Design a protein around this ligand. Structure first.
Ligand SMILES: *[C@@H]1O[C@H](CO)[C@@H](O)[C@H](O)[C@H]1NC(C)=O
Ligand SMILES: *[C@@H]1O[C@H](CO)[C@@H](O)[C@H](O)[C@H]1NC(C)=O
Ligand SMILES: *[C@@H]1O[C@H](CO)[C@@H](O)[C@H](O)[C@H]1NC(C)=O
Ligand SMILES: c1cnc2c(c1)ccc1cccnc12
Ligand SMILES: c1cnc2c(c1)ccc1cccnc12
Lengths: 201, 200, 202, 205, 203
């Protein structure tokens, strides 16, 4: 009926350890990085330290509620929620969470989680000081769940990029991938985010 | 009641996950940054490292109590109450909280949480060596709640600044913003603190 | 009694969130900074990185026990206690506490928590290389409790005996005076202890 | 069952602090490091900064379920599992896990925990600029459980540099995994460790 | 008993905050530092950054079990155990525990806690580049319990210069572990120490 009841009901029935696979078809996770800032770039070590928005979207029907005389959306801490086990495959630092750790939950079960991450990556810095800039690929996909459980998909440049960064974005491409691990035959999916940037001076 | 009863009552009944909106109105959150120190400034990267008191104030009627013969205010760990999910939109580091995680709650339900935060931002350092100084804009607002849920508003902000930093405050002006994105048909409010400072 | 029972009574009753106000009088907290080492002096930015034992003392009779054939003191984790919410107003880093966070509890309710803390401060470093040295002031006081709830008092009874013999610096004097602020919002008085650290390079 | 039922049963029955033996036989722990990136090398201090996936495998039959009309394997938080108390014996930094701390649990009781860990080590860095490269040995073994309780043996997958960053200053030449049985703490019992030798060199620009 | 039962009994009955004083006599805690690596040395500031194994042994009779048809030793998370409140008096940094925080408990009540700790200390670094080396003393003892509650002693039964990294930029010459008793001039009680004199030099 009210916000307190929904968050009470959500707290007590949300199964955070349980992926909401429905009729055993994959959970469609939509990940798009909104780049905000690029801090320290190294063309020698091929390392970048970047701040970006991880727009993450999925549906968890275990959260749904009747909206007749009730809020249309609530704000839920992700500790009381299932969050996809996303990992940046080429990160060389642990993701540093800048924002409060809440996701927005819609009454129909849609979940919107977008944390601020400061993280270091190993990618192609060659050409960052040149005219056409450097192209840095960041690969994000489920860490443990394969294609039958989590399906990751892009939304398809950033308008939220800080004008005061020493670097500037030229183009951002994010495409979907499908890989196979060298041990095990089922298929693990990732989204490929290509960051085209250069120095200003 | 005496303090033990109130703090028992607040701990066991507070819905820390629940926003205390009254009759579908937004929680009036009052943000004023009291700047304490600027430690590292870098004009090449346009980054500042700042220590400040993030004075935050709101009203939570679920915390109130009848204070006829009882204390007028208590001190509650912010884990046992709902705190607005504020986030500095232009920060490049996680807030380093230097003070205890306690809030002040008055008998009527007003809550005052003012932690000391050392945090790095990306803002305009250009002109920090000049006479008129550099002006660094910091935009602070709720990360998940929109305008009908949290309304942010400002309330002498250079009275506690360290007389020992290589930097000095010239002017501090605070305006509030309200943005509507092409995604979301709701309005998102933030307080933008423009910090005028220069080199010694 | 015995240690196992005493700590049971403290564990099961002591209200870590509740300040032990008695007859609505302020809780007299006694703060004395025992400086151990000065680790990073910077005269350009006026910043010091210092390690110190924060001798903090108050009385909490909700912990007391009749000390017949019983221990006169035990050792209690700070999670099972109310600890004053002291904060160095001029600190520029999080306090890094080096020792385990146990406090000493006397049978009458007196509590002693004296942790070793490494913390960086913004204070007066100018003159550290001259002979009489620079004096760096540290202001520590309760962050939420005002003058009627927590009263801070220096101990004016003692450093230069626990300071590291291997430090690049040497302590000249340590003086503690009391302060009281009234902030522009609320007609309360908020108390802090101002610890003056007179030190120089050797 | 379904995933929710399995994870309910596992969450509510896990004795995570209890090592999962049976017939008082040692737990078959299989550890093999897949190196992902070499970040900082220091030839003067003989210190290396490395990112690697620590593929760890053991069998815990208490997690098993009848898989008839049921999921084949699920994903369980390592907080709801016993994980071997493995430690890099020559480490000079705390292990930093970059990935979610989830393990993969199969209906037969098999567990797959493969975290991406960035850690600094003390090993022989001398020769990283030569052609044949430097050899960095990493000693991994249980910190408290001995050979009769935890036996470490490295695993089988494929290429030694199949997940190694092509953008690292360095390139892997060979990755060797050897098993040992020596003495830790004091004297009796047999204490096993896996010795992972990392052959790497600077890249030829 | 089986492994799960013993660890259950310890979890539910171990008094982690309660010191296990025996016959109202002090708890004999035995400290031995196994030096593993010397990382950063600074002769001007007199600071060393060290990785070492803190081998700790004590007896807690409340932890025991009849070892009949049951395991003779288990590994218990120190969250379910009493661990002495040891602190390095000469430390200038957080002790960085690198290993899992499990302790080994024998059916007789003896407990073994030996974590790998990376910590910085303030000691005499002068002479680290010379032939005889510097002597860096590290004093380890209980932080809140005094001598009649906790008695701290070295384990000299220690062979510690045996696990040191051959690849450290520095080399150990001597390690002495002696017993000390430090009394602060404020207060009459005395806190016992292990005094580790670490004689090492640069290569
Ligand atoms: C508050 O308490 C006083 C004292 O009992 C009572 O007279 C008064 O009606 C109360 N006010 C409320 C509940 O608003
Ligand atoms: C405390 O000491 C005695 C001895 O056990 C105890 O019986 C008594 O109740 C207490 N004495 C007083 C005066 O309260
Ligand atoms: C322990 O149990 C064994 C048999 O289970 C028995 O022989 C022995 O006496 C017991 N120890 C004690 C002290 O009762
Ligand atoms: C700036 C601040 N908050 C937001 C956005 C941008 C974009 C989306 C969004 C969705 C829910 C809550 N907040 C935001
Ligand atoms: C420093 C510390 N605490 C405070 C202030 C300054 C100012 C106002 C205030 C109001 C209530 C509680 N604490 C404080």
């Amino acid at each position: 009926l009210d916000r307190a009841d929904i968050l009470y009901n959500i707290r007590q029935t949300s199964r955070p350890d349980v992926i909401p696979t429905q009729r055993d078809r994959p959970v469609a996770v939509s990940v798009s990085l909104k780049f905000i800032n690029i801090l320290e770039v190294n063309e020698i070590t091929n390392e970048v330290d970047v701040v970006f928005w991880q727009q993450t979207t999925w549906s968890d029907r275990t959260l749904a509620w009747n909206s007749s005389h009730s809020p249309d959306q609530v704000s839920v801490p992700i500790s009381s929620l299932w969050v996809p086990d996303l990992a940046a495959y080429n990160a060389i630092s642990k993701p540093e969470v800048l924002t409060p750790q809440l996701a927005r939950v819609v009454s129909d079960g849609e979940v919107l989680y977008m944390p601020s991450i400061r993280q270091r990556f190993s990618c192609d810095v060659s050409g960052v000081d040149t005219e056409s800039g450097a192209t840095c690929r960041i690969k994000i996909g489920s860490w443990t769940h394969h294609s039958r459980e989590i399906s990751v998909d892009p939304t398809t440049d950033s308008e939220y990029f800080s004008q005061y960064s020493r670097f500037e974005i030229l183009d951002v491409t994010q495409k979907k991938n499908s890989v196979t691990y060298s041990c095990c035959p089922e298929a693990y999916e990732d989204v490929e985010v290509s960051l085209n940037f250069r120095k200003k001076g």
